[PDB]
Amino acid sequence: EVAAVVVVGSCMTDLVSLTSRLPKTGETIHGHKFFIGFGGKGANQCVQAARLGAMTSMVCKVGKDSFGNDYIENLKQNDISTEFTYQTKDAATGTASIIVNNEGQNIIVIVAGANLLLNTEDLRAAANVISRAKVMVCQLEITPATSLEALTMARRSGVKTLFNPAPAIADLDPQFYTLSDVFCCNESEAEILTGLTVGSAADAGEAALVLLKRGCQVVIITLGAEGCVVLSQTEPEPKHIPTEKVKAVDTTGAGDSFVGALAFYLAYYPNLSLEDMLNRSNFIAAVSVQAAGTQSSYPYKKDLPLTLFLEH
Amino acid sequence: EEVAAVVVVGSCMTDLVSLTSRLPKTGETIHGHKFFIGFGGKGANQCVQAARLGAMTSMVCKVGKDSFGNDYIENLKQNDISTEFTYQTKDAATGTASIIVNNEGQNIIVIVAGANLLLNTEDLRAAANVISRAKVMVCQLEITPATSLEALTMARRSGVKTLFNPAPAIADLDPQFYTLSDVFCCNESEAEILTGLTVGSAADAGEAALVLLKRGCQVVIITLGAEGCVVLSQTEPEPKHIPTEKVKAVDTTGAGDSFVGALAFYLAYYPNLSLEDMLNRSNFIAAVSVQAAGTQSSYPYKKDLPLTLFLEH
Ligand SMILES: Nc1ncnc2c1ncn2[C@@H]1O[C@H](COP(=O)(O)O)[C@@H](O)[C@H]1O
Ligand SMILES: Nc1ncnc2c1ncn2[C@@H]1O[C@H](COP(=O)(O)O)[C@@H](O)[C@H]1O
Ligand SMILES: [Cl-]
Ligand code: NA
Ligand code: NA
Ligand code: NA
Ligand code: NA
């Protein structure tokens, strides 16, 4: 089947060691638990959309190494097309090595790896899939130039663009904004992007407006527990969409659950209002927040209320 | 076809190595510039070196039923090591060593033993016929102490020479580890932990070695990085220093394991060399490993070494 949602972006393998204390320079320490997790903002977004029922295609680059083979199998296991998941001998699969002590303090070492080698030729080979999609989703864990090209290829075929500038970059190219039909980020990303302080939903509306003035059609800033705030060119007044309090268990990758869900709605429920989409998206993300383990916490359609999948 | 003359009961671990500009401070997320996966664990390293010199080896160990463990078995097989008693378990992940290295080669290392801790007495018992035909058993401390102790007893009772490497070392090690060791081999910092003494010299090491010898080892060897090693025996208790040639070290990681795996090779295949001789050859082989990167990848093959290392008494 033709994929409605195409995600051009990152896969990363989380390599997590639990220890009683963090090591000092020169020290070997014995930890008490290791585990592997599937991450990367692209793949996370793609998985959430897929689990809600989207036909997706993941365009990305991993290693020709075990991590990369295992990533491919995780995508397939989630019913994501891996036709343009490239494997390269030139770098390892992206990694995040995470050490956490008994106090919850951590050290993280990220090696973007093969994700940085995804390039223009790769995306051109994927032109069929990109052109026939309804939504293209991009972030900033691959080369910026590659994301920019993906956005451009989407615009030239009339595909809707959902851009998530995460992690944020202070001097982001002005074209990112003009190429973004929907531009979605969090509070600390907005601060980096605009130079402002965002300690309130009001402060966020002001940062959102700056971003909107740079040429995004729609700007959405996520606000953790506080839900999100939205503006558009047609409706420039910031509208706050709260989300009902829940007992958060692990909020890791909540933003990716949100974005993936938004991608799902944009592609499959185009006639919902934007306000409506963002409620459903907030809800789905809030579900992810109540279980551990990032992708493993992303709900499937069958475990969610049927109301999220009807009109009204 | 061929009987394994060297049996190694011990650890496999997957090395997960991130190169960075600086080591991360508490709470910090940093970006590194390179990631490598490697095959480690003191047992497997020892075994690989012996195998590459020509020994028929058998690796007794436990890894996960996971990708790391399937990859580890393929590494062993690729090095011509028997994996008949390399067990795989659903109950834990393959052991890991998560390593961050900065531009200066300083590091932080987090080891998670994982499946290596589940190697148990039933697993060893199945290996009894192999142990009984071996010439040398090699153990370390990266599996359960009790499992290593049982491997050493199973070796003794079959008349198989025991080569014990108490690494990582621990204060107040069971007295039986010494009495069950025909050859007991460790480095300077291990010797300090084991004896409570300070070893900042080859002379200091001889004194630590003597303590260790008094606890009942037949032969004690302490490795001394660039200084080579020092040896004592019950029959010859005077410490003998064996130096080794200044070479330009590129990466000394796993050099000790190269040294031990070579020694294991000699004990098994050249039993009539003098001990002094064995330790020159071993020093040399370990010194070659130090001139290339990547632990097992730096361990030389017999065909790439001077033919003089393979001649008899
Ligand atoms: N503590 C929380 N309680 C309920 N929902 C949350 C919480 N944190 C995040 N979310 C949801 O997931 C998204 C992730 O937002 P952020 O925390 O800005 O990455 C939010 O916009 C909410 O929809
Ligand atoms: N810089 C070096 N030059 C030559 N040989 C070395 C060097 N570092 C380690 N080795 C060899 O590997 C053994 C193990 O060293 P150590 O890690 O100190 O136990 C030594 O006994 C030497 O045979
Ligand atoms: Cl400790
Ligand atoms: Na985010
Ligand atoms: Na979660
Ligand atoms: Na050692
Ligand atoms: Na080396």
In chain B, what is the straight-line distance between the N-terminal and C-terminal CA atoms, in Å? 27
Q: Give the distance, in angstroms, between the CA of residue A36 and the centroid of all CA atoms in the same chain.
A: 19
DSSP state of A243: -
What residue type is assigned to position A228 of the chain?
A: C
Which ligand has the shortest distance to the CA of A37?
A: 5
Interval between CA A255 and ligand 4 midpoint (Å): 4
Q: Crossing angle, helix A66-77 and helix B67-78, to 10 degrees?
A: 150
Give chain B's largest Cα–Cα span: 59
Protein residue with its CA nearest to atom 3 in ligand 1: A225
Q: A308 in the Ramachandran plot: left (φ > 0), alpha (ψ -120 to 50) or beta?
A: alpha
Domain ranges of chain A: 1-312
Q: A128 in the Ramachandran plot: left (φ > 0), alpha (ψ -120 to 50) or beta?
A: alpha
Calpha distance A301→A51 (Å, rounded): 6
Backbone angles phi, psi at A205, to 5 degrees: -60, -40
Strand (E) or helix (H) holding A131: helix A127-132
Ligand 1 atom, smallest distance to A224 CA: 17
A226, two tokens = 């506080």
Contact in structure between A111 and A65 (CB atoms under 8 Å): no
CB contact burial A231-254 (16+ within 10 A = b; e otherwise): bbeeeeebeebebeeeeeeebbbb
What three-state secondary structure class fits A189?
A: helix
Question: What secondary structure does DSSP assign to A30-68, as a single string?
Answer: E-SEEEEEEE-HHHHHHHHHHHTT--EEEEEEEESSHHH
Contact in structure between B7 and B130 (CB atoms under 8 Å): yes
B161, two tokens = 């020479």
Calpha distance B265→B146 (Å, rounded): 25
Calpha distance A131→A157 (Å, rounded): 5
Q: Crossing angle, helix A274-288 and helix A254-268, to 10 degrees?
A: 140
Would you state the CATH architecture of domain B1-313?
Answer: 3-Layer(aba) Sandwich (3.40)
Contact in structure between A144 and A13 (CB atoms under 8 Å): no
What residue type is assigned to position A21 of the chain?
A: R
Residues with CB under 6 A from ligand 2: B 187, 223-226, 228-229, 244, 247, 249, 252, 255-256, 259, 283, 286-287, 290
The CATH number assigned to the domain with range A1-312 reads 3.40.1190.20
Contact in structure between B263 and B185 (CB atoms under 8 Å): yes
Protein residue with its CA nearest to atom 20 in ligand 1: A224
Q: Give the distance, in angstroms, between the CA of residue B308 and the centroid of all CA atoms in the same chain.
A: 24
Question: Residue B111: which of A28, A95, A109 has the nearest Cβ?
Answer: A28
Burial of B10 (0-12, 13-18, 19+ CB in 10 A): buried
Contact in structure between B299 and B54 (CB atoms under 8 Å): no
Backbone angles phi, psi at B54, to 5 degrees: 120, 0
Please name the method used to determine this structure: X-ray
Residues flagged as binding site of A for ATP: 186, 222-227, 243, 255-256, 282
Contact in structure between B58 and B7 (CB atoms under 8 Å): yes
Query: Does the N-terminal peptide bond of residue B168 adopt cis geometry, omega within 30 degrees of 0?
Result: yes
Q: Which residue out of A65, A79, A256, A303 is catalytically annotated?
A: A256
DSSP state of A145: H
Calpha distance B253→A33 (Å, rounded): 24
Strand (E) or helix (H) holding A264: helix A254-268
Q: What sign has the CA pseudo-torsion A297, A298, A302, A306?
A: positive
Q: Which residue out of B123, B257, B277, B304 is catalytically annotated?
A: B257
Task: Indicate if B257 belongs to the active site.
Answer: yes
Calpha distance A95→B290 (Å, rounded): 28
Question: What secondary structure does DSSP assign to chain B, as a single string?
Answer: -PPPSEEEE---EEEEEEE-SSPPPTT-EEE-SEEEEEEE-HHHHHHHHHHHTT--EEEEEEEESSHHHHHHHHHHHHTT-B-TTEEEESSSPPPEEEEEE-TTS-EEEEEE-GGGGG--HHHHHHTHHHHHH-SEEEE-SSS-HHHHHHHHHHHHHTT-EEEE---S--TT--THHHHT-SEEEEEHHHHHHHHS---SSHHHHHHHHHHHHHTT-SEEEEE-GGG-EEEEESS--S-EEE-------S--TTHHHHHHHHHHHHHHH-TTS-HHHHHHHHHHHHHHHTTSSSGGGGSPPGGGS-GGGG---
Question: Residue B107: which of A26, A67, A110 has the nearest Cβ?
Answer: A26
Nearest by Cα to A300 from A133, A75, A53: A53
From chain A, which residues contact B within 8 Å (Cβ)? 15, 17, 19, 22-36, 65-67, 69-70, 92, 95, 97, 99, 105-113
Contact in structure between A14 and A37 (CB atoms under 8 Å): yes
Calpha distance A264→A287 (Å, rounded): 16
Backbone angles phi, psi at A212, to 5 degrees: -65, -40
Interval between CA A248 and ligand 5 midpoint (Å): 8
Pairing of strands A56-63, A85-88: parallel
